[PDB]
Every structure is written in structure tokens, then in C-alpha cells.
Symmetry: D2
Subunit: 264 residues, 4 copies
């Protein structure tokens, strides 16, 4: 079938990519970076994230594979020495697939700008444009808290091992369809109050951020970060779309967690 390969750009990843392309030539495999059914990432998790966002409009027809040329990654979790064996089973077809949930982000503005929607594989964060960050947090049309601090982070299940982890969030198995909200240096006293604990939301729950004074926020989605003007609402919810991985052997998530944070 149609496939393509993205590379980190260094000497190790480019030559591994050329080797896999040459190996794919020995099989009925067509290179196509416009409508691929198999997208292979070579480098790190950042290389995988770019590959995800390059084809986020055909997620339902693509099975991703990540190869790490450096340290082990949560998405690029196959060593370069397994590249040749990867080519065989990838061209043989007939492989099982694993799907992870994604985060949907919706940004609404005033008159002049159309509602913008984004799709995140790791997390989406909100900070202020320069002054103090103050927003009202509304959960399913119910006012929950007035947050004051550095910012907030909403994470996918597979994204919990990234920025979410550094903020005290919990690591959840990617088979749980949920999203997790964490705080960034919240100010708490007798007058200002936040929950403090991370919050885990199931499907169909809508978490809304609404400005109090400043309407400009620095919003990030994975590696992309843009300053948004005249914002009326930020809307978070578990996406109905999922990312599909090609599965060729058992690499449990908790083993991947152990290898990355305990030892390997």
C-alpha cells in the first residue's frame, strides 16, 4: 500500500530512512506522502508529533509507526535494529492496530474571527499574554472555580507522561478515554481558591475557560504555540477522532513507563 517516512533530519535518521525505502522496494509498496496508509516516523517523539499533525486530516486511514534513533520514546518505541523486521511485516499487510484518544480544543473570538478548532496528541496549555493569568473554569455549564496563576494544562491519556507529569498530574493508561487538567503555580489564599488536585474528565464532558479581564492568551497545542487575541472562550473535550498505531509486538504502556522513568 501507499506509505511515507519522515526523518528527524540528522545523519543517523536520514540513512535509516533510505535503507527502509530500499527495503520497501523489494515489496509491493508505493511511496506516497500525499495519501499514505502507513506513516513511519524516524527520530524522537517530536518527530512523531510532527508526522501526526502533518496528516491529522486522514487519521482514520493511517496507521502510524515510530522509530527512535536516540533514547526510547513513548510514540517512537522501536529501535533502529528492528527496522528490517519492521519492513517485512509492514509490507506483508495483516497487522493489528491500536488506537489512542485525542484532545479537541476550540477557541472562540469576537466579531472578525472564525471559531478555530485544534487536535492535540499530547496536551494543550493556556498562559497569559504578559500580565496576570485569570480565568473562570466552567465544567458542563457549571462554574467550578476562578483560576489565578501561571496557566492550565489539559492532557490526553498518552500525553500524561509529558508536560502533565511535570505538573504533578497522574499517568493514566491510554485505553481510558479521558482528559486530565492540571494547574501551573496557582495562587491560593483566603480570598483566592482553586481545587489544586488534577482533574480527570470522561468523554462528553466539556471544560470551558472564560476570561475575566485580559482576553489575550498564549495557547499551545503540542509543539505549536500561538498568541490569540480577543478570546471569548476556550473549550476542551475528548475528541471523537483517534490516532491509530500499527502493532507488531507487545510493548505494554506500563513497561514503556518503567523503561523511561525507572531504568532500562
Amino acid at each position: 500500500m501507499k506509505y511515507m517516512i519522515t526523518s528527524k533530519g540528522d545523519e543517523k535518521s536520514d540513512l535509516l530512512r533510505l535503507n527502509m525505502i530500499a527495503g520497501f522496494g523489494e515489496y509491493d509498496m508505493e511511496y506516497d506522502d500525499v495519501e499514505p496508509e502507513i506513516v513511519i516516523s524516524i527520530g524522537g517523539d517530536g518527530t512523531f508529533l510532527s508526522a501526526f499533525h502533518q496528516y491529522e486530516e486522514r487519521l482514520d486511514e493511517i496507521a502510524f509507526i515510530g522509530i527512535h534513533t536516540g533514547h526510547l520514546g513513548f510514540y517512537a518505541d522501536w529501535r533502529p535494529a528492528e527496522a528490517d523486521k519492521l519492513v517485512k511485516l509492514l509490507a506483508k499487510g495483516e497487522y493489528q492496530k491500536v488506537s489512542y484518544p485525542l484532545l479537541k480544543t476550540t477557541v472562540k473570538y469576537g466579531i472578525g474571527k472564525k471559531e478555530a478548532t485544534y487536535l492535540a496528541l499530547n496536551e494543550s496549555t493556556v498562559k497569559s499574554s504578559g500580565g496576570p493569568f485569570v480565568v473562570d473554569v466552567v465544567i458542563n455549564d457549571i462554574h467550578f472555580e476562578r483560576f489565578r496563576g501561571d496557566g492550565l494544562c489539559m492532557s490526553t491519556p498518552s500525553g500524561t507522561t509529558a508536560y502533565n507529569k511535570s505538573l504533578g498530574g497522574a499517568l493514566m493508561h491510554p485505553s481510558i478515554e479521558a482528559m486530565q487538567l492540571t494547574e501551573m503555580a496557582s495562587i491560593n489564599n483566603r480570598v483566592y481558591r482553586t481545587i489544586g488536585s488534577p482533574l480527570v474528565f470522561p468523554k462528553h464532558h466539556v471544560v470551558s475557560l472564560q476570561p475575566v479581564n485580559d482576553k489575550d492568551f498564549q495557547i499551545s497545542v503540542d509543539h505549536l504555540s500561538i498568541l490569540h487575541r480577543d478570546v471569548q472562550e476556550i473549550r476542551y473535550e475528548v475528541s471523537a477522532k483517534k490516532i491509530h498505531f500499527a502493532r507488531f509486538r507487545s510493548f505494554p504502556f506500563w513497561r514503556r513507563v518503567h523503561d523511561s522513568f525507572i531504568e532500562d
Copy 2:
């Protein structure tokens, strides 16, 4: 149908119980504390927990209701002033039910003791009998970490607002079938390593605690706490059984979280 009412034992709760019993006499309602279909708790969450454990062998034929005579509780979430209105719709039958997941705990010993299983509504904790607490944490037959510290806590979703919250755990909506493991003052250095972050496990995942040197542990299940001798394994997993609540009006979990921790 058959019903019964437990009371905290103070003057406020006993008289409210007698009032509801008198009100139930005006309807086709039989008092039975042996095979009740409706169990009403009056007092606090601790009173509700005792009512849960008193009838944990007929959870599939009982719809629980909690009434708080003091502050708002996560299980006893109905004010005493709504008692009369509660009697009407409770005796009218025809009400919807909400189910929360439970935690299954299995304790295995050597020769002489039979495997003991417990059912928790909030959480189960493990500490040492006196010396240092050291256990190996095994996730789905895979060694994950060697934990050294004060202890560990495995929480239900609805139990996340209790002891789990005090240990840095995340608050998760009770509709998510999961369990959450948190650490208690773990020692970390160059030689001893733990994950630190809380872990959220889905259904069918088995988390096992195995001793290293001492085989005596102080194991708690909700309010009950017993010293266990000659322990070979502690086994945690989401229970196949659920607790059923009688639903008479919308009291969202996140609103219950807001009223208890933000303001009311």
C-alpha cells in the same frame, strides 16, 4: 418494598430516622434490615460507608441513599430538609439508579490461612507493621518498581476525593471504571527509585504488591484496618461489582466537588 435506615447515633440523626420511618408507614413500605431493597444512611460519609459494608453481599439488589445531618458529604449528599420529599418518591418506586465502581483487594498468605478478599468503596492502603515498608510493585505480571516509603494507597474513582486527594492524587469522575495508586512519602535517591506520579489503571489490570523482607503489613479497607501476618501478595483490581445509588435529582459530581472544596 423492603427498606431500612441506619443512623449516626446522635440526637439529630435518630429523630430524623424515626420521622422517615413514620412517613414510610403512610405507604406500602416494609421495614427490613435483613433483605432490604433500599438502604438509607443518615449522618455522614462514615455512616454511609458502614451501611455499604453491612450489606456488601447484596449490592446488586440494593439502592443506597445518603442524608447528611452535618456538612455535605460525597455519598450523603441530601439535606435533612429534603427527607419528606425523599420518602414520597422512594415509596412511589419508579426512580433511576446510578452505579459507581468498586475496588477488589486480595490478600494471599502462606500455609495455614485462606486467601481473603475485600471490597472497598473509597480506598485500600498498605503500611508496614513497624519497621520499614518495602514492596515490589508488579503490574500485569511485569515488575514495575521497588517501593520504599510509608505506604501505598489504591483508590476507587469516588474515593479520589478522600485519602487519595491528600496524597496528591487526581480527582476522577466516578463514571470512569478505574483505580488510582498513590505513594506515601516515598524515599528517592540515586539507589532507590519510584515513579512518584499517581497511576490510573483501567479494568482488568492487576496491580500486585510483593514483600521484600518483612511479610507483615497493616492493610486498611475504608475504615477497617487489620494487621496481616505472613503475607505473600497483595492484589488490586477494579471490581466486577458496583454500588447502586437511587437518583432523585441532578447533583453533579463536579458540583459536589465544588461545594466541598471551593465554597457552598
Copy 3:
């Protein structure tokens, strides 16, 4: 003696300032905002911080007083109703003074820029200009750690109740001549390692931040925040200068902590 009064700018603070000026006219008190010996701040802690930085070159000849027109502040800790009584003892002379330690910040550049030194009453923070923040932390010419994360915060003792507190730092009594370093969402795994815990340094200890790749950092000193280019080193140490307060009654720091965070 010579005195001056700064105001928050709102209607409540301006009229209180005019009242105190009129009261000072009944005594031998000269208004001078060039060489004052008494600087009175009316508003909040932010108003006090501006007054501190306006006269940070004559700290050894000025006794500060803070008046809070809103909620209680750690520096503006006198209610407006005590203004008249404040005027009497302030003009009577003869009052005791309390001194708090300050933080000295030194920023070194390459060729073209002179070494810049700053004096902070609360804290100084360092973040990246846009990309990832990575610095080597050197303590008394000894390499301690390579920090990767959002940033770092070095706090004065009296500044520990501000941004330091939101980052997990400890609250220390302002009579202890020290400074406290805290982390901002540090990334930790098997390859990247930080201490995690806050660090408290005594006098004459020098903590140095040295770049790894990017040499541009967003450095803050209290409310001021400037992007610094071509930075070679950031140097932190307890300042030899102290801020002097005029003391007219016992308001213990721990009581001030209790009133602000527990209840009042």
C-alpha cells in the same frame, strides 16, 4: 523629618494620602520625595514594591511603612483606620526599626554589555525566551545539576509567601538571612535529573545559572521583567543591603501568615 507618600491611584488611597499629609502639617514634618527618611505606601503589596524600587539607592536612610486599603498585605499590613495614630508616632520620632534581607541578582553578558545588578525584595525568576529552558546550576563553583523545565525562582525570606509559595517552596521567617531556590515544572526521567526539593542557601553562598544552548532568558525581578540577550551567567546571592521598616506595634510574621492564608 523628610517624608513622602505613594498612592495606588484609586479614590480610596488618594484621599487617605491627602488626609495623612494634612495631619503631618500639624507636626514638624517636611514633604520630600527626593531625599525622604520615611516612605509611606498606601494600597497593596504591589504599591509597596514600587515604593521600594523607587528608593532602592537610599535604603540605608529610609524606614518604610505600608498601609493596605484592600486586603491585608505582608508589607502593607496596617489598616486605613490606624492612619491618624500612625501620623502621631511617625512625627514623634523615636521608633524601633525592623530589617529584612534582600536578594542580589547579577547578569553577565558578552562583549558589548556591562554587567547589570538588580535588587529584589520578593524574588527573581528565569525563563526561556521561547524555546526550551536548559541551564547548568553551579553552587559555589561546583556543578550541581543541569536543569530542564519551565524555569527557576530564587526568593527572599519575606518573598517566600509570594511566588515561592505557589511553587512548593517553604515559608521562612524573615529574620533568617537566606535565599530559597525553587523549580518550575522540571522534567525528570532516566536521562535528565534535578533535585526537585527547594534549596535554602545562607549568606555568602553563590548560586550561578549558566546557559547550555540558548543564551536568551526572560529574567524577572519582582514586578519588572526584561528579555536579556547574549547572557553568559546569572548570579544569585543574599544581598549585603537590607530594607528597614518602621515598627510601631507587634504584628508577628506568623500571625501575618495565618491571617492571609488560614483566616482573619
Copy 4:
């Protein structure tokens, strides 16, 4: 002068002790475990702590030395290979000394028990005898908070790298004469409130714990832990006594922190 050596009891430490005793015989050194001026500990920090408490009534006439036969310790910070060189300079006399602050603990009872005072090198902790732990925290005769949770920990400066560190406390240089109080899984909601942050107290500040309902507490001092009955007050303050170390080369505290927690 008079000296003595304590051993961990294993084969490595006993033989190293006999070797040092034989080496001391080549000099004017008298073995005396009743009135020694030099106390050498061989093993780990736990071996050093026992040596400290064995001679805590002659701390002003003893210079301690710690030798670690296993991993590096904060008190036993000299490798076994430096034992022979240690004997020479120890018998040569003429060495500088370093002093660390200690924590004084005072426990008061009702009629029948005399006030008991303890001296801690690391920390003192308080937990409940079985039920819930609730105490009022009084700072310099001022009520600060009502603590509810698992317990509290008051640490010396050098003790901050031990149990204090596991509870989120800050690491402070042992030259700062202070003590640090940390919380153990405190319950916080709209009705119950604690400061949360660790607190650092200078000399002459008195922190008092007073019971609310239960008067039985499990009080620990370093490795010793005793259940105290009918307790009226627990009193913490920086001790006027200090522990003296013999200094033979520069091993900075922050380097000792780096070697133990970052890498070595």
C-alpha cells in the same frame, strides 16, 4: 586522647574497626567507650545516629567521624579506603571542627509523669495512636492552625535530606540555625484548613502541638519511636546544644547532596 569506635556489626565494618584500632595503637591513643573525645562510626548513617544518641550527654567534649562501608551517607561521608589516612591526622590532634544544630523536643503529661526532653539529630515526628490525628499548632503562644491528617515532622537542617525531603520539605544548609516543620497527608476542604507549605523557624521560636480529642500520640525521635499516653503538649525548638564533627578535608554539603541524589 580517648577514643572509641562503633561498628554496624557486619563482617566488613568489624574488620575495618579492628584495623583502625590496631593503627591507633601505633600512636598515643587510648581506647575508652565511657569518656571518649573522638567517636568514630563505621557503617551507615543509622550507625552514626546510634553513636550520636549513645553519647548525647557529652556532645560538647566529642568530635564525631563517620565512615560509610556501603553507599555514601550524609554523616558517614568517608570511604573505607581513607581509614589509614584518617588515623594519622586523628592521632596527630590539631584538626578543625564543624558544628550542626540539633532539635529539642519536650513532651508534657498530666499528673503522674515528669516532663520528658529529647534531642534529635535528624527529625521528630508525631502520629496518632490509632484513630484520627488532630492537633492545634501554636507558634510562640499564638494559635496558627488546627492540623488534621497523618502527622507532622519537625526536622533539623542536616535532617532535611532524610524524612523531611520525602514530605516535600526544603533542603537547607546545616550552617543555618533553624528547624523545619512539614505536613503528612493533611486533609483540606472548606471546613478544615492548613498552611500546606513547609515552615522554617529560627532560633528561640517555640512551636507547640496541643491535643484536641485524643491525648495519645506515637512520637518518634530519629530511629526511636514510643507511644506516649496522656499528653498535654509537644514542644519543639532549636536546641542550644550542637553536634561537633572532626573536619579533615573539604566535603561541601551541596556536593554531598549532589552525590547522593543526582549522581556520583
